[PDB]
Amino acid sequence: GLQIKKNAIIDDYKVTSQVLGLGINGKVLQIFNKRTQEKFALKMLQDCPKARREVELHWRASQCPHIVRIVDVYENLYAGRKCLLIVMECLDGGELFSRIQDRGDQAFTEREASEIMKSIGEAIQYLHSINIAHRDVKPENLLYTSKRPNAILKLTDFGFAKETTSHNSLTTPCYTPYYVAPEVLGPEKYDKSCDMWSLGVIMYILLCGYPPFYSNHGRMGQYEFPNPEWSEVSEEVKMLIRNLLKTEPTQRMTITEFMNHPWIMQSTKVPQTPLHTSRVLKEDKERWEDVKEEMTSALATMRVDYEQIKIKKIEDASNPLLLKRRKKARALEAAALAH
Amino acid sequence: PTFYRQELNKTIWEVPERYQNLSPVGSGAYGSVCAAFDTKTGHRVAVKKLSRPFQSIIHAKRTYRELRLLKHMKHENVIGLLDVFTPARSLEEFNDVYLVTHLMGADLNNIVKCQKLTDDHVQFLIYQILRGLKYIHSADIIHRDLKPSNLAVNEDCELKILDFGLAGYVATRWYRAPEIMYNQTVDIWSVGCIMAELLTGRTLFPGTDHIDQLKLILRLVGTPGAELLKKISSESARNYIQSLAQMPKMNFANVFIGANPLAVDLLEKMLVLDSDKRITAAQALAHAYFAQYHDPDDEPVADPYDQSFESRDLLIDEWKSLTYDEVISFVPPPL
Numbered sequence: 001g002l003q004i005k006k007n008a009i010i011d012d013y014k015v016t017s018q019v020l021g022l023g024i025n026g027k028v029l030q031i032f033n034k035r036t037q038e039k040f041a042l043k044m045l046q047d048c049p050k051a052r053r054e055v056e057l058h059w060r061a062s063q064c065p066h067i068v069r070i071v072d073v074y075e076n077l078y079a080g081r082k083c084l085l086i087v088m089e090c091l092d093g094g095e096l097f098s099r100i101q102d103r104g105d106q107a108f109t110e111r112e113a114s115e116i117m118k119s120i121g122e123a124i125q126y127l128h129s130i131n132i133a134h135r136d137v138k139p140e141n142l143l144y145t146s147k148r149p150n151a152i153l154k155l156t157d158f159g160f161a162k163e164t165t166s167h168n169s170l171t172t173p174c175y176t177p178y179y180v181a182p183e184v185l186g187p188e189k190y191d192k193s194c195d196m197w198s199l200g201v202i203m204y205i206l207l208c209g210y211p212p213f214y215s216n217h218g219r220m221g222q223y224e225f226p227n228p229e230w231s232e233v234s235e236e237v238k239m240l241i242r243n244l245l246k247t248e249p250t251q252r253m254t255i256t257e258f259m260n261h262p263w264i265m266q267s268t269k270v271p272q273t274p275l276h277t278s279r280v281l282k283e284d285k286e287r288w289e290d291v292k293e294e295m296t297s298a299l300a301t302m303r304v305d306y307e308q309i310k311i312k313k314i315e316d317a318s319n320p321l322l323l324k325r326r327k328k329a330r331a332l333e334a335a336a337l338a339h
Numbered sequence: 340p341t342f343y344r345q346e347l348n349k350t351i352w353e354v355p356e357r358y359q360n361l362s363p364v365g366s367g368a369y370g371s372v373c374a375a376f377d378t379k380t381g382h383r384v385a386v387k388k389l390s391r392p393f394q395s396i397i398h399a400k401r402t403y404r405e406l407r408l409l410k411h412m413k414h415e416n417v418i419g420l421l422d423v424f425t426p427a428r429s430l431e432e433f434n435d436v437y438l439v440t441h442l443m444g445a446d447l448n449n450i451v452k453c454q455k456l457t458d459d460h461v462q463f464l465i466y467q468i469l470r471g472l473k474y475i476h477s478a479d480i481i482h483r484d485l486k487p488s489n490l491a492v493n494e495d496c497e498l499k500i501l502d503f504g505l506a507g508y509v510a511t512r513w514y515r516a517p518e519i520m521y522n523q524t525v526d527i528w529s530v531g532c533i534m535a536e537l538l539t540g541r542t543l544f545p546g547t548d549h550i551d552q553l554k555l556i557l558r559l560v561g562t563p564g565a566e567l568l569k570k571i572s573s574e575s576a577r578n579y580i581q582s583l584a585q586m587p588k589m590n591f592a593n594v595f596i597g598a599n600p601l602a603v604d605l606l607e608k609m610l611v612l613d614s615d616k617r618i619t620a621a622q623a624l625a626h627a628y629f630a631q632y633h634d635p636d637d638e639p640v641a642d643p644y645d646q647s648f649e650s651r652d653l654l655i656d657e658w659k660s661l662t663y664d665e666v667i668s669f670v671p672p673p674l
């Protein structure tokens with residue numbers, strides 16, 4: 001029910017120069033609706049089908065409290081460009097994991113860790129309920145509303161989100177042949193499932209304060225659960241994670257299962273056991289960047305890029321090398337007729 | 340040569356006015372990439388802003404390393420540097436390195452999820468990958484982290500091998516040879532795993548934890564015999580392996596059903612455990628799979644580039660002024 005507005009946004013809001021952080025696709029400004037004096041962030045994209053879907057999706061999703069509210073969408077010309085200006089709920093609360101590092105420390109708990117997840121869980125559950133995959137659930141798209149203690153957590157940036165198909169995944173049999181059969185292509189199976197993979201990783205970090213990746217040298221997971229940090233954690237929690245990180249998209253845990261699991265379903269009453277995460281995240285700001293960077297890297301391999309090209313059949317393909325060699329086929333053909 | 344500023348990928352980019360239409364693209368992982376257009380050359384280019392290049396010494400070193408690699412990489416099936424620039428006017432301002440490159444269409448990681456590559460596709464792509472490695476290998480350089488998401492391909496099935504950073508954290512390593520869990524042949528194992536995936540649709544060895552990864556590998560290529568057992572380093576490695584139900588390698592003809600016999604043959608030679616018995620890139624290109632594309636008078640080597648001060652240990656500013664030298668001293672390729 002999104003009514004993209006046609007007039008100049010400045011008729012309705014005052015656009016300030018106060019910068020609220022640089023966006024992927026431009027600069028996010030503070031603005032103020034003139035009628036209410038309410039404050040809002042203003043992000044902006046270039047107008048084009050992708051962007052107009054991206055915003056439709058986000059508009060729909062906005063109904064979820066753990067998703068950042070699109071308030072209003074204008075279509076104007078900025079800097080010689082057709083633009084979608086997007087007025088959004090302002091979020092002054094920083095990234096999720098930064099909050100944890102910013103602590104007394106009141107030790108970060110397990111009960112605290114469960115809510116955070118349930119929140120992220122609700123946001124997906126909503127998204128998936130209406131057949132939409134956000135495909136970039138990661139720590140920099142998970143902002144709190146504010147510095148205040150009642151602050152709510154929210155999922156943001158719909159730049160990789162897309163509508164997807166509600167299809168049952170089959171549950172693979174116990175007995176299989178030695179041979180590798182051909183894949184039945186179904187790219188869409190990497191959609192929702194991507195979101196479930198990210199929940200697994202963010203949960204893993206949340207609990208210990210490092211990621212479940214390897215290192216290259218030889219504080220890195222390797223999909224084990226190192227003592228000491230993990231000594232205090234339930235085996236039912238670890239199995240959640242293994243089931244979340246299942247490398248087969250058709251076999252991986254589905255958000256419904258996630259949100260039924262007791263550690264979630266009954267989070268209000270989860271063991272209070274304290275956690276290392278904050279003191280670990282404090283250890284090395286430089287390392288935590290590499291966490292963020294590898295997670296973004298990993299996600300690329302776990303979602304399809306439906307934007308990328310298809311490879312022409314070879315006899316329809318032409319390029320330097322492809323002729324260099326064909327040009328040699330005919331040089332031999334000719335040489336043999338010529339003598 | 341003047342620049343313009345522009346807010347993109349969460350930082351203030353300033354690039355030469357020759358590069359227009361900066362659109363972001365790709366993961367945006369280890370530095371951020373933008374699709375552009377280069378009016379000087381006339382064609383379409385990937386422009387990459389290095390991320391946090393002089394934060395640590397560790398970084399500062401790698402940036403310098405990466406750069407000299409890239410400056411010495413002149414091959415059709417390898418990522419090559421069209422341009423490198425900096426808005427800085429002197430070492431005192433030196434803050435950001437930018438790199439320009441050809442722009443491709445897709446990566447093979449993504450191609451495999453979307454498309455049923457024919458045998459001819461597989462011939463041509465693995466050809467181009469191996470053609471590339473021979474060069475890389477002749478330069479005394481191991482790629483290490485070779486994988487499908489480093490194989491850039493455009494729509495006419497051109498292939499270029501990307502990403503020499505290793506030559507931090509890595510999410511999975513399905514394509515990593517068991518030794519490095521090492522010769523150049525480490526790279527051939529990756530080409531092994533990749534070819535497998537192109538032929539099949541599926542990751543060959545989609546291991547979960549590390550234990551798992553090893554079992555999955557060994558489940559294809561057999562457990563080692565005592566001869567090659569003795570060559571393993573860690574005692575607890577030797578044990579683990581000997582704690583398994585022991586078994587021979589299997590006929591790849593029985594695994595890769597309906598593949599091209601020649602492909603299977605080659606795949607057999609690429610995925611051998613004994614690294615000292617594994618086929619080289621040079622050798623691979625001669626294999627009969629690639630009849631259609633093997634031309635030895637156009638499978639060029641590289642000339643080597645020295646250690647210089649890459650086995651010298653230095654302060655940040657020391658790597659920083661060395662990198663500057665390489666940026667200013669870069670010279671473009673012929674138009």
Ligand SMILES: CCCc1c(C(=O)Nc2cc(S(=O)(=O)N(C)C)ccc2C)cnn1-c1ccccc1
Binds near residue numbers: 385386405
């Ligand atoms: C990261 C891949 C982006 C991409 C490139 C690219 O990454 N270029 C590139 C490489 C290196 S690198 O390989 O040396 N490296 C990672 C260190 C350094 C600098 C640039 C500019 C080319 N095409 N696409 C591309 C791929 C798929 C679709 C569309 C475009």
